[PDB]
């Protein structure tokens, strides 16, 4: 068949005018990680403690001296759930370590 | 003293063609007392035709043996897949008997692209005071290949062996093992270790180099 | 008609070598019957040593004249072959056959035994890890080898197993090579790049069997992912 | 021929140098040009273009390297998309501003 | 020694066919010299029709007996072949050769002319566009064809050009096929998909040449992308 | 009346091997007055050997002609690349002369996968009242192939032609054209039009179907 690092969780949220389409409007959530090796990360979405099993598309991990990689994910959400102040957490499992990142729309 | 030489040393055949084997003798043979033998790499040899005139018991009629004097051609029709072995011709009219070199046959397969993987020695082997670097090749055809070591722009010779396996039953390929042995003092002075492979199917030699203690 | 060979397998050079060509099912009372000796080094062709006819008449090879002795026996139905002045470069597997008639020569062959002529004794096989270094182009498949050195004789069958006590199709196996008196063998295995990056195994074992000691040592598997 | 859906993402309110993604999924044909602006000025360097993937529709995304100081000062980063001669603009700003 | 054939190329069935085998460089005064006729349909082998020897002695094929006439001439150095009761299925290219001796037969062949036996007249070729429907898997390349129908005789060479007055390597060209008396031709080109989805050319022209009218018609490119 | 049959009708050869051509005759020939001819697809035929005994002027010595009676074998050594044409045997001792069938040779090339592209007829062709569907295949080997039309789970026969091109100089392949002609009234009643291809190199037939006026 010697570089061991930790992933950096980066969660993207839509702006105040990022919703479009017929009512109810829908948006997307992106959780990316860069500068980490190896790549045992499994994409998992948690909505207020509830595991999401539908509406997500896990794209294949691409390729960006250690060899780094990047993974891009997409989760379909709704505008109604965004107005109820629901915290979305991007679960990251890297070599057994659990990485969490709580985001919301509170100013 | 009769010297028997079988030329060529190797030949590529096909499953269902004619394979001609030659048996050159230094001098003549009385009453054409030349016999052929079949030996499998892993089993015991067997006698096919005695005296090059009549066949023995248990030998199919597809084996034909003719020729007299200093020429003996062993023609075989319908080469079965289980007959790709090394054959020999032996005479018993010389007082005593003598043997030859032998001819090795193989299946004519298209030339592929081998992938050479060099394994640097581990740290546990260096503790004993000896080091060895291997140069393994897989899926190459034919057996004829050249393996050379180029360390610090210098060619090493007289201290490397070349051992090759047999023909695969399901792949019809070969695999050689070239191990470069050296001492502990001769391993801590050089920097780059690699082996050069020259293959018919490759338009340019491929060298796999690494760094000392950086991989 | 069957034959069987027996004798020592580990002998020292320049001493005494004795082999017995045991046969049963016929007698040396007719004419045109004789037993010879044929050896083949691992990499060379067949070599003639000696031949003995009936009525107490034996011949010897001029190349090895005054170096071999033939002693037949009609009571034990076997022939004793004494080989003096051994040489490590003469290591070969000896065979013996029986001739039935003048035209038929060496029809019923035996089995043969492997005799190694070396000054070294029977030592346990020393296994060493072989860490792979495949940089730049990952290519498609990467193999891992298991070094085997300082073993005698060559009676080691390599076997690869996973961490969870499974079976790995080794298939590929290289023969041993003479290394200053001893033998050295190397065995690799083609592992797919998909299974390695999926499992969590960090090392694999190299289990081998030898009648002079069952040694084993795991090699590091830094994985790719 | 359909109009691509331009969507520009923004960093979270509670902190995160972040990145800007301008998705243009559900577009045809395959060729598409995506650029970036900064307060109405052309951007020379500081951004890349990921290869177009396959979701018949495709997917094209772009990454812009920005800073936290230059993002919370009322700066507009319009994702100019030229598709079949049609220039698509999307002006975004701070949600809490 | 050279020969040349000439005559009409478009004739009607069941009328009168006349061909001349013009030769110059020898005379029919010696022995063992004769001129024959050999035809070959486009898809069949050579067929024998008749042969004439010297001293006013000619033979005829029993299969076509009492159907062909041979009229030689020592003044114009040519032989007139009159063919009555024509048949459209007998359309073949006729040849004539000269024999020098009894052993040597048909040594110096001529050139030959194409004679088409059909009831139709000479009409300009009609080109029709061929829309390519390559859905699901476009594979590697997308091809576009230019149909050719209602042309006589088969003397059309395809030539593909780009929209900006360029040259396209056609190479691949199918022969004509008899379609109820007339001929139909089809020709395509392997155009890479990279130059189609990127370029602004929405259609290509299909320019062909014919001695009965230079017709041309561009074909649309629906593309796949 | 002597009938000459040349079997087999086709044979695959190699650039530098021996090509044997047979010429079977219904009866015997007096004084062995059988001659061979060489014809190129696009040029005029030529005479190579007259009487199967002596060669003519301008013919290389590599062409050998032997045989007598009802057997005539044309053996050629060193098959040049510019000799892959159709040869014929003709006799002139029958009063009158007769010809045979002929044997077509080709270059032994590896089997590839053809790429079938079916082009539905355009709207301009339907205005004239006639419709035609083509089934074009390229880059396939050998020439032997099966093309069948399956429209509305029905096999159409007796109204489709099969025209194939010659061997390419740089590709050594072939290209056949299968046009399915029909009337305007018979085209507005069916829905799916496709042609089935059965190739040796393909383990499953590939069908390329479309929709009427929806592509
Ligand atoms: C031991 O672990 C290995 C992991 O390296 C297992 O191999 C995987 O499981 C399947 C099913 O047995 C194998 O066919 C594949 O090689 C591996 N899967 C993937 C997705 O790579 C192996 O199965 C384990 N052994 C046992 C007995 O469960
Ligand atoms: C006509 O337009 C075509 C575009 O379809 C041009 O083809 C391009 O130009 C290069 C060089 O001539 C060609 O080799 C390629 O096929 C095309 N380029 C790319 C990037 O696809 C063609 O050159 C134009 N003709 C002339 C005379 O300029």
């Amino acid at each position: 068949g010697v570089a061991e690092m930790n992933p950096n969780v980066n969660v993207f949220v839509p702006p105040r005018d990022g919703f479009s389409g017929p009512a109810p409007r829908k948006s997307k959530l992106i959780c990316e990680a860069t500068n980490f090796t190896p790549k045992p990360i499994t994409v998992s979405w948690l909505k207020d403690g509830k595991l999401v099993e539908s509406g997500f598309t896990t794209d294949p991990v691409t390729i960006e001296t250690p060899q780094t990689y990047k993974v891009i994910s997409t989760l379909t959400i709704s505008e109604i759930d965004w107005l109820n102040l629901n915290v979305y957490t991007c679960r990251v499992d890297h070599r057994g370590l659990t990485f969490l990142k709580n985001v919301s729309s509170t100013c | 003293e009769i010297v028997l030489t079988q030329s060529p040393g190797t030949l590529s055949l096909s499953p269902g063609e004619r394979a001609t084997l030659s048996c050159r003798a230094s001098e003549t043979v009385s009453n054409d007392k030349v016999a052929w033998y079949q030996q499998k790499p892993g089993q015991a040899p067997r006698l096919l035709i005695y005296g090059a005139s009549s066949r023995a018991t248990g030998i199919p009629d597809r084996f034909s043996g003719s020729g007299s004097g200093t020429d003996f051609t062993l023609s075989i029709s319908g080469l079965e897949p289980e007959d790709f072995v090394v054959y020999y011709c032996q005479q018993y009219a010389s007082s005593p008997r003598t043997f030859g070199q032998g001819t090795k046959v193989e299946i004519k397969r298209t030339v592929a692209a081998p992938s050479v993987f060099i394994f640097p020695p581990s740290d546990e082997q260096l503790k004993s005071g000896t080091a060895s670097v291997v140069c393994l090749l897989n899926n190459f055809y034919p057996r004829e290949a050249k393996v050379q070591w180029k360390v610090d722009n210098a060619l090493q010779s007289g201290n490397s062996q070349e051992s090759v396996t047999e023909q695969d039953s399901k792949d019809s390929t070969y695999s050689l093992s070239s191990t470069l042995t050296l001492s502990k003092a001769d391993y801590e002075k050089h920097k780059v270790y690699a082996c050069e492979v020259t293959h018919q199917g490759l338009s340019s030699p491929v060298t796999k180099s690494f760094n000392r203690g950086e991989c | 008609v069957t034959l069987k060979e027996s004798g020592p397998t580990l002998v020292k050079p320049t001493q005494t070598l004795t082999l017995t060509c045991t046969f049963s099912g016929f007698s040396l009372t007719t004419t045109g019957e004789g037993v010879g000796w044929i050896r083949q080094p691992p990499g060379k062709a067949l070599e003639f040593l000696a031949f003995i006819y009936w009525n107490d008449a034996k011949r010897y090879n001029p190349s090895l004249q005054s170096r071999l002795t033939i002693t037949k026996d009609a009571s034990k139905k076997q022939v004793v072959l004494t080989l003096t002045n051994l040489d490590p470069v003469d290591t070969a597997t000896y065979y013996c056959a029986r001739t039935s008639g003048w035209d038929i020569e060496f029809e019923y062959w035996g089995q043969g035994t492997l005799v190694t002529v070396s000054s070294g004794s029977a030592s346990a096989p020393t296994l060493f890890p072989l860490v792979s270094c495949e940089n730049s182009s990952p290519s498609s498949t990467v193999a891992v080898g298991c070094l085997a050195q300082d073993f005698l004789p060559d009676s080691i069958t390599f076997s690869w197993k996973y961490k969870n006590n499974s079976d790995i199709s080794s298939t590929r196996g290289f023969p041993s090579v003479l290394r200053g008196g001893k033998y050295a063998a190397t065995s690799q295995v083609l592992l797919p790049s998909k299974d390695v990056m999926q499992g969590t195994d960090e090392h694999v074992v190299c289990k081998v069997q030898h009648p002079n000691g069952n040694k084993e040592k795991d090699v590091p598997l830094p994985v790719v992912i």
Side-chain angles (χ1 to χ4, degrees), chain A, chain B, chain C:
Chain A
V2 298
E4 299 292 338
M5 299 182 61
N6 300 330
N8 300 120
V9 184
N10 299 91
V11 182
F12 302 94
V13 294
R16 60 180 300 180
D17 60 330
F19 300 92
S20 60
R25 299 180 296 181
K26 299 180 180 180
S27 179
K28 299 177 180 180
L29 295 182
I30 302 181
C31 177
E32 295 180 0
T34 53
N35 190 21
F36 65 99
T37 166
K39 42 179 181 179
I41 170 182
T42 301
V43 178
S44 300
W45 296 92
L46 300 179
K47 181 179 60 180
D48 300 330
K50 300 300 180 300
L51 178 60
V52 181
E53 300 180 0
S54 60
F56 64 97
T57 300
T58 299
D59 300 330
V61 179
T62 60
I63 300 180
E64 300 181 2
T65 300
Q67 185 69 208
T68 61
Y69 301 94
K70 56 181 282 77
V71 49
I72 302 180
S73 179
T74 300
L75 176 62
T76 301
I77 60 178
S78 180
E79 183 183 3
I80 302 180
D81 300 0
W82 184 267
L83 299 180
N84 297 124
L85 300 180
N86 298 18
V87 180
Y88 300 93
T89 303
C90 176
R91 180 180 180 90
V92 176
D93 300 330
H94 182 276
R95 301 300 300 180
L97 300 180
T98 300
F99 299 92
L100 303 181
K101 180 60 180 180
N102 300 120
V103 296
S104 60
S105 60
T106 60
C107 297
Chain B
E1 180 68 23
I2 301 181
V3 180
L4 286 76
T5 301
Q6 303 185 203
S7 60
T10 179
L11 183 60
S12 300
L13 286 313
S14 300
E17 293 186 0
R18 180 181 300 180
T20 60
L21 302 181
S22 61
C23 181
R24 180 61 61 180
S26 60
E27 61 180 1
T28 180
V29 51
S30 300
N31 300 270
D32 300 330
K33 297 300 181 180
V34 179
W36 296 84
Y37 294 87
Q38 177 180 359
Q39 181 178 2
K40 189 173 180 180
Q43 284 74 14
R46 61 180 301 179
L47 173 63
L48 298 182
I49 300 179
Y50 57 97
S53 60
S54 300
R55 300 179 300 270
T57 302
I59 283 80
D61 60 330
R62 57 184 178 93
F63 297 92
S64 60
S66 60
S68 60
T70 60
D71 300 329
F72 296 95
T73 301
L74 182 61
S75 180
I76 170 180
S77 60
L79 180 60
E80 300 292 338
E82 293 78 10
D83 299 331
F84 290 90
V85 297
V86 181
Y87 299 91
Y88 304 88
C89 56
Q90 181 268 167
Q91 50 86 202
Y92 52 92
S94 180
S95 180
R97 304 171 177 85
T98 55
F99 291 88
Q101 299 292 151
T103 58
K104 181 180 180 60
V105 301
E106 60 180 0
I107 302 180
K108 180 180 180 180
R109 190 180 181 270
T110 60
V111 181
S115 57
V116 47
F117 299 94
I118 171 178
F119 298 91
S122 60
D123 301 330
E124 300 181 3
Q125 185 180 0
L126 301 180
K127 300 180 60 180
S128 300
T130 58
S132 300
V133 181
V134 299
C135 187
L136 300 180
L137 276 67
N138 299 326
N139 300 120
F140 69 97
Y141 189 87
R143 184 261 181 92
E144 300 292 338
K146 300 300 180 180
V147 179
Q148 298 180 0
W149 298 89
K150 299 182 301 180
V151 42
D152 297 332
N153 300 330
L155 212 169
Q156 300 292 151
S157 60
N159 66 111
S160 60
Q161 52 85 203
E162 180 180 0
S163 180
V164 70
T165 61
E166 301 292 338
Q167 181 180 180
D168 199 334
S169 60
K170 300 299 180 180
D171 199 13
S172 300
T173 56
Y174 299 92
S175 299
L176 47 79
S177 60
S178 180
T179 301
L180 181 62
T181 176
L182 71 161
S183 180
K184 182 179 181 180
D186 300 0
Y187 185 80
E188 300 180 0
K189 299 181 61 180
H190 306 77
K191 180 60 180 180
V192 47
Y193 305 93
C195 52
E196 181 184 8
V197 43
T198 300
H199 191 64
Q200 181 180 180
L202 278 68
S203 60
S204 60
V206 180
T207 60
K208 298 299 181 180
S209 60
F210 64 95
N211 300 270
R212 179 183 60 180
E214 299 180 0
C215 196
Chain C
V1 179
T2 177
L3 290 81
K4 181 60 180 180
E5 296 79 7
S6 60
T9 60
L10 209 168
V11 296
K12 282 77 180 300
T14 318
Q15 197 180 0
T16 297
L17 191 273
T18 301
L19 295 179
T20 59
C21 176
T22 302
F23 55 90
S24 180
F26 55 91
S27 60
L28 35 280
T29 60
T30 180
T31 60
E33 180 180 358
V35 180
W37 297 90
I38 294 91
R39 69 179 180 180
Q40 180 183 4
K44 299 182 180 60
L46 302 179
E47 182 179 0
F48 182 83
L49 298 321
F51 189 87
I52 170 181
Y53 294 88
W54 72 101
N55 68 268
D56 190 70
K58 29 74 180 60
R59 277 74 180 180
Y60 300 95
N61 196 317
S63 180
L64 302 178
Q65 187 179 180
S66 68
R67 205 180 66 91
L68 302 180
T69 58
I70 303 298
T71 56
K72 63 177 181 179
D73 180 70
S75 300
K76 296 181 296 298
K77 299 300 180 300
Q78 61 180 1
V79 47
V80 180
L81 188 272
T82 300
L83 216 176
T84 179
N85 300 90
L86 298 180
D87 200 319
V89 307
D90 299 331
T91 298
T93 303
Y94 300 89
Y95 299 93
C96 59
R98 183 254 181 176
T99 65
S100 60
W102 299 87
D103 300 0
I104 304 180
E105 302 291 336
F106 298 151
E107 181 182 6
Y108 299 93
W109 292 81
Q111 180 68 209
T113 175
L114 211 169
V115 180
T116 301
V117 181
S118 60
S119 60
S121 180
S123 60
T126 60
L127 302 180
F128 299 92
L130 298 180
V131 48
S132 180
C133 176
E134 181 68 22
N135 202 270
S136 180
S137 180
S139 300
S140 60
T141 59
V142 51
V144 50
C146 174
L147 195 273
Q149 197 180 0
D150 298 359
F151 58 93
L152 205 285
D154 179 66
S155 60
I156 298 180
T157 300
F158 299 90
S159 60
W160 296 84
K161 298 181 180 300
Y162 286 111
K163 184 182 179 181
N164 50 17
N165 189 88
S166 300
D167 301 70
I168 309 182
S169 300
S170 60
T171 301
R172 302 299 180 89
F174 298 90
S176 301
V177 57
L178 182 64
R179 189 72 64 182
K182 300 300 180 60
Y183 293 155
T186 305
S187 180
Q188 58 179 350
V189 53
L190 288 314
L191 300 180
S193 300
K194 209 279 180 300
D195 301 0
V196 178
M197 67 179 182
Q198 182 67 210
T200 180
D201 301 330
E202 71 285 348
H203 62 162
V204 295
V205 298
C206 174
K207 300 181 60 180
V208 296
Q209 53 277 4
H210 191 63
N212 300 120
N214 300 20
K215 300 298 298 300
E216 58 180 0
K217 180 178 299 180
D218 59 329
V219 300
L221 184 60
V223 325
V224 184
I225 298 181

